[PDB]
């Protein structure tokens, strides 16, 4: 059946009996860095199955007024087992990902989530001159950011979902790898993205390569609103490799 999917990564296996196929960002499957493209000369460390496994973040609650949510990678996994440990003990990291978003309701519920993976999602600030989004705000961790909640601070990012938090129109996010979770059709979304950057490896601490954005474009409605409908995110690194070992970096 083309409605079913099983994804096995390391010691984790995820399933969904109502998928809308899967997406491979830019049609490129994640792969390890080759010697022709590499620049750093020390032998890389490749944790393999101890890092290339599904890590489930904190679930979020989707309700009639939700404006959306976003996470940044690898920030979101900074505290996830071996993968997390590796991004702080090394100067350089490189990884692809399998992002599996989960959301089920009932055949009597309706709602639609636009699930997007944006490369270099450089956030903007609003009406604050040339002051940019503070490091703290673009590094929320597994908790991510809940659009429409944060009590404004000067260095706080734009919270306008219709402007992609960056001065561009929401309707055009579809140009990035994406899927929709239309409650009437599927209960999950699956996106597999390769490493994308202008350099072969980079600092996992100060550079977030991908941003996962989830915006409810079609409002959640049903005649049984008391039943909470969560949204859960499970991300698995792929071909994770690190270089430039040393002491563990401590942020803040």
């Amino acid at each position: 059946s083309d409605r079913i999917i099983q994804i096995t990564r390391g010691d984790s296996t995820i399933t969904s009996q109502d998928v809308a196929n899967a997406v491979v960002g830019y049609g490129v499957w994640p792969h390890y860095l080759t010697p022709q493209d590499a620049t750093a000369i020390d032998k890389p460390t490749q944790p393999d199955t101890s890092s290339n496994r599904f890590y489930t973040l904190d679930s979020k609650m989707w309700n009639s007024t939700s404006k959306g949510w976003w996470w940044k990678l690898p920030d979101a996994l900074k505290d996830m087992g071996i993968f997390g440990e590796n991004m702080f003990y090394h100067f350089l990291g490189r990884s692809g990902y399998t992002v599996h978003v989960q959301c089920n309701a009932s055949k009597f519920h309706q709602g639609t989530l636009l699930v997007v993976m944006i490369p270099e999602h450089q956030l903007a600030t609003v009406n604050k001159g040339n002051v940019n989004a503070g490091y703290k705000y673009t590094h929320p961790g597994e908790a991510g950011r809940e659009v429409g909640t944060q009590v404004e601070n000067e260095k706080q990012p734009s919270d306008d979902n219709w402007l992609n938090f960056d001065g561009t129109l929401l309707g055009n996010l579809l140009i990035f790898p994406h899927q929709f979770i239309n409650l009437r059709s599927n209960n999950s979304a699956t996106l597999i993205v390769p490493y994308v950057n202008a350099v072969p490896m980079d600092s996992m601490v100060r550079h977030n390569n991908w941003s996962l954005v989830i915006i409810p474009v079609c409002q959640l409605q049903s005649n049984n609103i008391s039943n909470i409908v969560p949204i859960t995110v499970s991300i698995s690194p792929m071909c994770a490799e690190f270089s430039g070992a040393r002491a563990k970096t401590v942020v803040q």
């Binding site: 960002g25 830019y26 049609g27 490129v28 022709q36 493209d37 055949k107 009597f108 519920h109 309706q110 709602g111 639609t112 490369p119 040339n130 979902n161 219709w162 129109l169 929401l170 309707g171 055009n172 579809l174 140009i175 929709f180 239309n182 409650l183 009437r184 059709s185 390769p194 490493y195 994308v196 950057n197 202008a198 350099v199 072969p200 915006i215 409810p216 474009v217 079609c218 409002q219 409605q221 049903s222 005649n223």
Partner: protein, 238 residues
């Protein structure tokens, strides 16, 4: 030396010329190029990707996600009109879509357009709708019967959430102007209730619909020009 005749145009600077010039950094060797996923070689690649139409961009909706959805519901009158817009790739509300934005960087366009619609209601919500394209030389249809006489698709809502209506290139001339010009206005897309929006008891009485657009294999843009969909009214400072 070799006798030469300096021709008109010499010494001029045309922003679109294609000449060679000495390199200011002789001997400099550029950084090795590495593989990066997602390379684009031609803008047509971007025109072929669906993007949402802010079709419901009424003043009260602009600035909200709702400007992208159209609401459907049980009707009391038959064959009611649902929406109506011009087909012109660079007119409003198509203007800010990716294909509309790119079209706004050119003066001419041609080819067939692909409009898609995804029903956002519950799995138990049924509906039949008629999507029609009215070729030019006549006003927009005032009724379903009037619209139905043109190019159309009857969409039945079911397991497959999305339907597509192709607006074939039906024009006197091989190309049309992208800017709103009478002579080259391409027609309309209207949507009507074919049957009705029906639901079982205890099911929401309204549902949303998302609208997409992209170009077909024959879509093409011509004559590069600056866009009027973006401006600068002051200095951009550091």
């Amino acid at each position: 030396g070799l006798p030469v005749y300096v021709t008109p145009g010499s010494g001029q600077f045309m922003t679109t010329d294609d000449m060679q010039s000495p390199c200011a950094l002789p001997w400099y060797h550029p950084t090795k190029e590495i593989f990066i996923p997602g390379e684009v070689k031609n803008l047509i690649e971007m025109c072929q990707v669906d993007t949402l139409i802010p079709i419901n961009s009424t003043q009260s909706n602009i600035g909200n996600v709702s400007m992208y959805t159209v609401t459907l519901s049980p009707q009391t009158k038959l064959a009611e009109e649902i929406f109506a817009i011009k087909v012109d790739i660079a007119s409003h509300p198509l203007a800010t879509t990716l294909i509309g934005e790119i079209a706004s960087y050119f003066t001419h366009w041609t080819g067939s357009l692909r409009f898609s619609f995804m029903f956002c209601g519950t799995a138990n919500t049924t509906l039949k709708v008629l999507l029609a394209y009215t070729p030019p030389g006549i006003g927009k249809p005032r009724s379903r019967k009037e619209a139905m006489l043109g190019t159309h698709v009857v969409w039945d809502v079911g397991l497959q959430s999305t339907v597509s209506l192709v607006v074939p290139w039906i024009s006197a001339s091989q190309y049309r102007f992208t800017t709103p010009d009478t002579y080259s206005s391409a027609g309309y897309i209207t949507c009507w209730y074919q049957t009705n929006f029906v639901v079982p008891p205890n099911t929401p009485n309204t549902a949303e619909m998302l609208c997409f657009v992209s170009g077909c294999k024959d879509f093409c843009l011509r004559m590069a020009r600056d866009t009027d969909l973006h401006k600068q009214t002051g200095p951009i400072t550091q």
